[PDB]
Amino acid sequence: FGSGNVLPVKIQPPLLRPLAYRVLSRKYGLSIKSDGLSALAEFVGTNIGANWRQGPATIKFLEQFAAVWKQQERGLFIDQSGVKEVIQEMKERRDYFKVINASQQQRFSYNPHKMQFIFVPNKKQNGLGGIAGFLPDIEDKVQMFLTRYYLTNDRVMRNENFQMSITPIKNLLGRDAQNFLLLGLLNKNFKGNWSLEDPSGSVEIDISQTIPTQGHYYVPGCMVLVEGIYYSVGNKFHVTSMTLPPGERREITLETIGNLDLLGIHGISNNNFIARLDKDLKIRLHLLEKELTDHKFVILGANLFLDDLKIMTALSKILQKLNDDPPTLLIWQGSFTSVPVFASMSSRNISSSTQFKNNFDALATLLSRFDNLTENTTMIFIPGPNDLWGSMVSLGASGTLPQDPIPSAFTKKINKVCKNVVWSSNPTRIAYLSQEIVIFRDDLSGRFKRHRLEFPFQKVQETRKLVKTILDQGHLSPFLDSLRPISWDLDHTLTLCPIPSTMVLCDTTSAQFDLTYNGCKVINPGSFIHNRRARYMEYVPSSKKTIQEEI
Amino acid sequence: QKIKNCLIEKSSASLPNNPKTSNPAGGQLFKITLPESVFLEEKENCTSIFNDENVLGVFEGTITPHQRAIMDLGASVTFRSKAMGALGKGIQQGFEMKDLSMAENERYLSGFSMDIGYLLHFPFLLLLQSPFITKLLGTIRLLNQMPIVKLSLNEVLLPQLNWQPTLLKKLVNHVLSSGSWISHLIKLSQYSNIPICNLRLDSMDYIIDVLYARKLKKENIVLWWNEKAPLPDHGGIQNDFDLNTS
């Protein structure tokens, strides 16, 4: 705040504290600590020449120092940071974008009694966790599906059409007739019979004369709306109709939840208070469309193999063109190895972990050539089924959904050759200004096709069916714990109660598509190489996309 | 469908027993044989029998032509053509082997008389002794066209001080062991019926795999053979988490 005076005379704070006290402690603010007072002596002594008898200068300085403490939350006591806020003041006279992993995402529970979300303190911050702090507790296993049921039932009960209403199952134990609307998990009992389950209880289900609503998938492990008649001669709910819970747009969903900063980039929330913000959204929507079409981030075709030579040559040819106009973000996705890497008892050949390391060293050679792409592009690394830690147990199969990033030990100098590189979990959330994008990599179509209810009674239609099921169920894993185990405390990562604005859903078993639904956009990159053709697609935050091919 | 010039036939082969797949239902297994070129062609179109509704599994898509021939014919293959004298026609084009094939006895493979060479790295039937077979093969494209017996001793290490004597000692034994290498290779090959160059010395599980697979093919049992994959090929059900398997 100004310079060029004679020299910084040194004076003791005793002759400075009365003015600061009257301006701060009396009127607005308080707690000028002794160390903070000594800190506030240097900057006022920088322009000390002909002052303490002057006019506005000191008062305006104290006013400006108060401005930070009204703006930032800070606290009460003034400490050695007092110079740190004046650095911010002189600062005053893209950004705000992040990539959130599964582990670093904030946790929020839901109270059905209160219709509201309650914060959960993270165990990493306060718990010691020096030896075992990531491990969940058994109580989460008991509430894992109860949390899903509560979220879906709230949405079902707030729909416009419903006001027959959904009845708890145990309310059917004495009735011999009438109709009921039951909502619950569809599964198989330990006896092998199809059944429906809600927190109240369970009931067996008869499909012998069921007429389902075509247009979506009926896989065990998902919420289903059902209608029929209950017979007390046995215990059977004879079904006459079957559907899935309706979906809800995020604009109508946000108002119910207020303005909670779930993926909070505005700020953070703790056990004391939560954060909301509305006025900034309009101006940042303005900035999103303020002639920023130059931003360009690219998702490559999934499942690219580094060990193969033709794939590496095709990637070099693709980066040749990417060098010309550097993408804003470049997301390398899919399994980076063509074979699962396991303990490899045979040591006659070179170890598979060392081979994994070596295959990540050729990337440095191929990438160091293109200096501009290093200089002004950020790369996002998505894991796959055959990466290091998972394949040590699953041996190439698909297991736990929250998949940890690639270890930093076997990939070390790719952080040097490239400028911005971030490793991310299998499900991740890119927060770009007023936009949330979800990155997910698995084969969904095969598992849907294999597991269907099969009621006793052009290929792009399957894509619409998959999109509708995934979006209406509001969850990325419409499956029981048997088909796919889930980390108990990380399940909130996989629940889409607010529908994401943009979705990255790659499946090698499903053809590429571009669909729109209730307030979102779903794109499907897949099969990096196909029919001797290497494909990769571009997407722009202004909701336009392009497909670029290089044999 | 009749659209494909293949041969399909209902079969009763004995399937493997995955713990998850337990329901008997019915039996309508098929034995579709179809050349791989039109199979690649059929990969393109959407509508085809291999990709349609109600498909439970493909059970032997992993086996390569190389493995099929090394398991069916073996080292001692002979020509039973007869018919028209297409020996010249067979040699100018590619001899199709499905129609005409026979495996003669291999009791004495070779009375060896041939020149042998070396090629070694320490980071005509030539013998390749290198830590990285693929890298050396790719760097010199001319190396592919010549026959090589690939024996790999890997992971050279150094004490970092006075390494010249230890390099000399490591070179001496590899120089002098040529007579032993070829002799042991022929000794294994004469019983194995696998060709000499395909077979490796340290590789011992490969012999068991080929013998067990062909004596299984003598029976009607399905191979479940899977290549460079730690899990069996059960038709795709092996790509899902199961409690009993875990």
Asked if A483's CB is within 8 angstroms of B241's CB, the reply is: yes
Query: Does residue B228 belong to the interface with chain A, where contact is any CB pair within 8 Å?
Result: yes
Query: Does residue A349 belong to the interface with chain B, where contact is any CB pair within 8 Å?
Result: yes
Nearest to A531 among B44, B228, B243 (CB): B44
Asked if B241's CB is within 8 angstroms of A398's CB, the reply is: yes
Nearest to A484 among B155, B202, B241 (CB): B241
A237 Cβ contact partners less than 8 Å away, ≥ 6 residues apart: A172, A180, A182, A196, A203, A204, A205, A206, A226, A228, A229, A230, A231
> Nearest-CA residue of chain A relative to B133?
A349
Which chain B residues in 127-156 lie under 8 Å from chain A, judged by CB atoms?
131, 138, 152-155
Residue A237 is which amino acid?
F
CA distances from B172 to A53, A196, B126, B167 (A): 95, 75, 18, 9
- Specify burial of residue A298 (Cβ count, 10 A radius: 0-12, 13-18, 19+): buried
Calculate the CA dihedral of residues B185, B186, B191, B197 and round it to 10 degrees. Answer: 60
- Test the B interface: residue of A190, A217, A307, A349 with most B CBs within 10 Å: A349
Tokens for A50, please give them: 């002909």
The total of other beta-carbon atoms located within 10 Å of residue B172's CB is 10
Q: Method of determination?
A: cryo-EM
CA nearest to A82, candidates A22, A129, A127, A33: A33
Distance CA(A18)–CA(A67), nearest Å, equals: 19
A139 Cβ contact partners less than 8 Å away, ≥ 6 residues apart: none
Distance CA(A537)–CA(A300), nearest Å, equals: 6
Contact A341, A355 (CB under 8 A): yes
**Secondary structure (3-state) at A299:** strand
The pairing of beta strand A514-517 with beta strand A436-441: unpaired
Q: Which residues in chain A have their C atom more than 2.5 Å from the N of the next written residue, marking a break after them?
A: 93, 163, 457
CA nearest to A510, candidates B46, B57, B152, B240: B46
Q: What secondary structure does DSSP assign to A426-460, as a single string?
A: SSEEEE-SS-EEEEEES-HHHHHHHS-------TH
Query: Does residue B202 belong to the interface with chain A, where contact is any CB pair within 8 Å?
Result: yes
Distance CA(A301)–CA(A511), nearest Å, equals: 12
Query: Does residue B193 belong to the interface with chain A, where contact is any CB pair within 8 Å?
Result: no
Asked if B236's CB is within 8 angstroms of A446's CB, the reply is: yes
Asked if A396's CB is within 8 angstroms of B236's CB, the reply is: no
Instruction: Provide the shortest C-alpha distance from residue A532 to chain B (in Å).
Output: 12
Asked if A342's CB is within 8 angstroms of B241's CB, the reply is: no
Instruction: Provide the shortest C-alpha distance from residue A339 to chain B (in Å).
Output: 6
CA nearest to A172, candidates A78, A121, A237, A220: A237
- Tally: H helices and E strands in chain A: 16, 20
- CA angle, corner B14, sides to B9 and B18, nearest 5? 120
> Nearest-CA residue of chain B relative to A530?
B44
Residue numbers in A near B152 (CB within 8 A)? 348-349
Instruction: Provide the shortest C-alpha distance from residue A341 to chain B (in Å).
Output: 9
Q: Which residue has the tokens 């190389």?
A: B66
Query: Does residue A157 belong to the interface with chain B, where contact is any CB pair within 8 Å?
Result: no
Plot region of B173 (φ>0 → left; ψ -120 to 50 → alpha; else → beta):
alpha
Calculate the CA dihedral of residues A416, A418, A419, A425 and round it to 10 degrees. Answer: -100
Which chain A residues in 419-478 lie under 8 Å from chain B, judged by CB atoms?
443, 446-447, 450, 458-459
Tokens for A496, please give them: 């889409």
Query: Does residue A483 belong to the interface with chain B, where contact is any CB pair within 8 Å?
Result: yes
A345: enclosing H helix or E strand: none
3-state secondary structure string, B79-122?
Answer: CCCCCCCCHHHHHHCCCCCCCCCEECCCCCCCCCCCCEECCECC
- Greatest CA span in chain B, whole angstroms? 74
φ/ψ of residue A502, rounded to 5 = -135, 140
Asked if B155's CB is within 8 angstroms of A350's CB, the reply is: yes
The pairing of beta strand B77-78 with beta strand A544-549: unpaired
Nearest to B241 among A397, A443, A459 (CB): A397
- Specify burial of residue A222 (Cβ count, 10 A radius: 0-12, 13-18, 19+): buried
Q: Which residue has the tokens 């046995």?
A: A234
A298: enclosing H helix or E strand: strand A297-300
Residue numbers in A near B236 (CB within 8 A)? 446, 450
Residue B167 is which amino acid?
L
Query: Does residue A339 belong to the interface with chain B, where contact is any CB pair within 8 Å?
Result: yes
The total of other beta-carbon atoms located within 10 Å of residue A316's CB is 13
**Secondary structure (3-state) at A85:** helix
CA distances from A545 to A140, A522, A524 (A): 41, 11, 12
φ/ψ of residue A484, rounded to 5 = -140, 115
A362 Cβ contact partners less than 8 Å away, ≥ 6 residues apart: A306, A312
- Greatest CA span in chain A, whole angstroms? 102
